[PDB]
Structure 1
């Protein structure tokens, strides 16, 4: 994907300070809370009945860490998101049956978490660079759907 030098540096710089374990858990937990329909993919995760239950669920935090970790990998290959995510794209379609619209929801929830965690440092221009990145990632993940 296409990022200006300014956008790439804003992206890269912020990510250097993100604890993936921590943000990953928060991002997935908030998704399940704000968009409860998404719980349809995690029936075996335990108790997701309340925000507190969702947020302290170890299975949620574990999964959260896995997802953002794969997300961190694509950040290293911004020039070829589609090639980077082809295998997971096919997995998510063929085995998991996840509607790609959910990739977009997660992308928006992640932006919210970054703004929450970073405050004032997450400026309008920084957000803009991240918005382009999560849409890119969402597109790369839906690419092999059929």
Structure 2
């Protein structure tokens, strides 16, 4: 997110996630569905059990969007425009739920890369996920 230091930290952290992005984001979605069952009601059309092809496919897509965001930190509104329309206009996702998914992404990363997940990395990634969530809810007009 916005600051130069936070941008450096997020790009570093995301580079170390690297090819694990799709697996870590599927895991974060599972953690969200398990811990915060209200969030499952957005995915009645999915099998949400463990090992779900639908959850793994969707984790890949969400991870790709996060990777695009990490590459476009100065123009997230444009880079994420279609997704802002989808989440705010079409799906009407409650803003609280972005906090839940962000928290589960932090949990997932902390679990898998604990030495890398310092307090400074946690603060910078939290600010990134808040900035992405703000853009995705921007059409709340």
- TM-score normalised to the size of structure 1? 0.88
- Higher RCO (CA < 8 A, seq sep 6+): 2
Answering whether residue 72 of structure 2 is matched by residue 77 of structure 1, we say: yes
**1:61-100 aligned within 5 A:** 61-100=56-95
Answering whether residue 7 of structure 2 is matched by residue 11 of structure 1, we say: no
Please name the residue that 2:111 is paired with.
116
CA shift, 1:121, in A, is 1.5
Answering whether residue 23 of structure 2 is matched by residue 22 of structure 1, we say: yes
CA shift, 1:100, in A, is 2.3
Q: Report the Cα distance in structure 1 between the residues aligned to 2:37 and 2:121, rounded to whole angstroms.
A: 28
CA shift, 1:125, in A, is 0.6
Q: Please identify, of 74-83 and 34-43, the stretch whose mean Cα deviation from structure 2 is larger.
A: 74-83
Helix, strand or coil at the partner of 2:140: coil
> Number of paired residues?
139
Q: Report the Cα distance in structure 1 between the residues aligned to 2:35 and 2:82, rounded to whole angstroms.
A: 28
Please name the residue that 1:45 is paired with.
46
Higher helix share: 1
Match of 1:126 among 121, 133, 137: 121
Structure 2 stretches of 5 or more lacking a match?
none
- TM-score normalised to the size of structure 2? 0.91
RMSD: 1.4
